[PDB]
Structure 1
């Protein structure tokens, strides 16, 4: 249940974790390092953006494009009509790329884990994060 209160909490904590400037790369690195560690085959999906070297300028630009799109969706969590249109466009950037369905719940788990690591686990609301993140990826995959 990504409730109206849940959405505001997620927006607040996401902005805190994502941050400004290079702090966004700190969050991105936590996400990709975790994802690639858990799902080794996922790295190959990024061969065109140098997924073999996540510290390269090429992969970092990719990483920030991805977190930028997640940021854009999170920011619009309390504006569903616009969010649905954003998700629809993001879906066009992923369909027919052969991305394994499993990659999405894995990315969700890595993103949530990275935010939690950044803002602190005490009192962290996993139901709000999982339910809202799921609403976002469910519009992107398939």
Structure 2
């Protein structure tokens, strides 16, 4: 799915949860802590950015690069031609890195849980968030 109305909703709630300044680090910590707890083998994928210490400056910069890329895709959800080009470039930064296919549904689940935790669960549209996040990661994975 991820309808035109869905994309407006996800854009609004993402900007709210992502936020400004150091609030972005608050959202990232929620994502990586959840992801590494659910999928502990994912931490080793980030050994070059010091995934053993997510509070380090090295990993926080990596985290904000990732969330920055997700923000960049979210903001372009209503601009599909540009989105497809953004995803194609992101794919080139992930291919043949040995990233397991399971990492992407796991990341989606952790990102949705963290946004849900930040903006509040009541009336949270999981169908809109899952379907639109799935359009993003299916362009990056594989």
Task: Please state how far the C-alpha of 1:116 moved relative to its aligned partner.
Answer: 0.1
Task: Please state how far the C-alpha of 1:105 moved relative to its aligned partner.
Answer: 0.1
**1:36-61 Cα distance to aligned partner (Å, 9 max, x none):** 00000000000000000000000000
1:46 aligned partner = 46
RMSD (Å) for aligned C-alpha atoms = 0.2
Aligned mates of 1:38, 1:86 — CA distance in 2: 28
Q: Extract unaligned runs of 5+ from structure 1.
A: none
Aligned residues: 142
TM (normalized to structure 2)? Answer: 1.00
Task: Please state how far the C-alpha of 1:97 moved relative to its aligned partner.
Answer: 0.3
Aligned mates of 1:16, 1:133 — CA distance in 2: 16
Q: Extract unaligned runs of 5+ from structure 2.
A: none
Aligned mates of 2:76, 2:37 — CA distance in 1: 30
Aligned mates of 1:13, 1:134 — CA distance in 2: 16
